[model samples]
Target: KPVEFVKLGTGVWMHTGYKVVPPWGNIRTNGLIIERGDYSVLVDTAWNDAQTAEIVAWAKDTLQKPIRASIHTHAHSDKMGGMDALHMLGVETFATDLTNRLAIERGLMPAKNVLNISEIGSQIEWEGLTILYPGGGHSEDNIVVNEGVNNILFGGCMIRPGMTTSLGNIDDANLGYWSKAVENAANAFPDSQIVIPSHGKPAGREILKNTAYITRP
Candidate 1:
């Protein structure tokens, strides 16, 4: 499937890429490209380097803003599978230390820089975006990115898409703390009306509540 892009707000764009997985037909993953004057900051990689490289090309040729840096929300391939491509293109990449460790263990390349956000609810500002560690949800080291200018929250794999009952890939999930983690993220970015999930289309705050409800034990 081809990669797609849609404008979310002023200078924020949501990029979606697809892959075919067994009986699931085609599955899509979402990420972001936030324009920063002459450059852009990426939220997450698609599924692989080729797709991610396409995103970078779009930002450069279409938006006229090259991607200067990127941040992975978790250690999953869908989030950082393109770390190699990003690095090769000279785009600085970052993720939490735990994420980097897990990436190595999971056979995915780790980002070059550490995000320096370890505490739950703690956030750090990078490239004008707020990166928050809202406890663990979809994965033990999952984090969320918020673009304040557009009030859009890049929930990564933490916030499930739509009203689905599935918890997605739980092999590395923190099931016991997932619901609380979603709640923490909701509280952390109360103004974020638009929430972008990794596996589906963007939705409103209700998706956050939906994820918490389904994950509640």
Candidate 2:
């Protein structure tokens, strides 16, 4: 399947890639590309290296803004499967220390730099994006990214797609704290009108509320 990109707001674009998971068939994952002064910053990688490389090429050739850096939202392959591609292209990459550690344990390549956001509610500014640790919902090392210029929240896999009740993957999830994590993200970026999820299309803040509701024990 082809990877797609859509403009979300001024200087912000959403990149969606597909992966075929058995039984579930084709599943799509979303990320972001936010343009900086002369370059762009990526929120997460696509489902694989080739797909991610496509995004990089698009940014450079089409947008005329090459990707300078990237940050992974978690250790999952869906978030960082293209780490090697980014490294090969000399694009700087970052993730929380815990995400790096977990990525290694999970056989995924860890980002080159540590983003220094560990504690729940802790937020750090990187590449003009706000990276927040929301206490682990979809995964123990999951984090959320917010682009202030466009007020779009890159919820990664932490926020459910739509009004869906499923939490998606729970193999490495902190089920007990997932709902609270969603709440943390919502409160942390109250100004974010658009929320982008890793496995689904972008939606309003209602996705945040829906995720928090369905994940509650």
Candidate 3:
């Protein structure tokens, strides 16, 4: 396999990030797995239909827990396509309302991608885990997540630190507003010790204060 899984903490494992080519050889998107008792939640599904099965198998065997849900970081396929596979194992899907809208409006699912959002909420709290949607950046539906003790925030696609994050080229993106939203997220989650970006490496909260967000031209 081109991708490997790295265990980050107790009952926590991160599938390694890898490039994927749609239509043919698809590499599973890097994802996060969090275990709450006997149930597990996956952060994103990168692989297409064919590849997703393998990833799910890996997850099931590796975690030794039933998957409860699939967390869509945004409406993008690279993040959502594997829901059907994971769902086959009885996993539900979740995201913010805006992200759900993006999936519906864009018709990403029928395109053989992950876009269907089954649930939406600005904040999701379960088993002491907290995920907060800071709102709008790479896409209008972009959101963020803050882990309980790890104090780690999944910045989705927008909140990439060190590297520059671009606004939506498809629709509903206001760079000016995006910057403010990320700024707010940084401030709101004051204790966030680290930020896990979609593309680049994670960084400290103070780094967000010094960097430009999607608004940067």
Candidate 4:
């Protein structure tokens, strides 16, 4: 209800600002930081770099961890607008086909509103690299990255307490089976304990299990 923050690492913390949006009553805008590591990746860069330039700079200067790649939780502008700035910082921007497609349709990505090949979700298997896609709710392209050792699961847009009943902005939502996709994702990652959502606090599957509580169907 009130503004709060939770420290996730020695230097990493979750900045939580609550909000009330239509349909969805109280909500949260929460992203994460890798702080200092072999190489850091930002799960969801917020809408503007203005709110985070200082923090981003500190990660590079004080923590000695420059963001290597910027990943978007979904196609929402709030989650992907920082891609350009991250690119300037020599970080590659990545998004799943679904998000990229949403971006292209919304006139965000390159190629005249059409996603490029690099926009698709390809296998990324490095020591700390892991590809994530949940496949429903918010958008059909929702994804959740699991940092091998970071104990983090980037929850894209589907990382809320209530179960996703359907897509909100139907420009590209596959509403018929959005909820099923959520179940599939939950089943897919049984071991991930923490979730770094697109716009909310980091939580475990218990909060996610609320998806089953909504009788919106």
Instruction: Give candidate 1 regions above 4 Å deviation.
Output: none
The superposed Cα distance between candidate 4 and the true structure at residue 4, in angstroms, equals: 9.3
**TM-score versus the correct structure, for each prediction:** 0.97, 0.97, 0.78, 0.73
User: Relative to the unseen true structure, what is the C-alpha lDDT of residue 65 in candidate 1, on a scale of 0 to 100?
Assistant: 96
Worst 10 residues of 3 by lDDT: 110-119
Candidate 1: residue pairs that collide: none
Report the error of model 3 at residue 212, Å: 3.2
lDDT string, candidate 3, 1-217, tens digits? 5456777666766765466456544322456778778777777665455555555667678667766776777777776565556666677777665666667677664212233223323465754567666656667677666676777666766655464443323355656566676776776678877766665555677446544433665
Which ranges in model 3 have alpha carbons more than 4 Å from their true place?
20-29, 110-122, 161-172, 210-214
Model 3, residue 186: distance off in Å is 1.0
lDDT of 1 by residue, 12-80 (tens): 999998888898788898889998888999988888888898999999899999999998989887777
Give the Cα lDDT of each candidate. Answer: 0.90, 0.90, 0.62, 0.57
Q: List the residue pairs that clash in candidate 4.
A: 28-199, 30-200, 163-211
Once superposed on the true structure, which residue ranges of model 2 sit more than 4 Å away at CA?
none
Question: Over the full model, what C-alpha lDDT does candidate 2 score relative to the true structure?
Answer: 0.90
Candidate 2 colliding pairs, count? 0
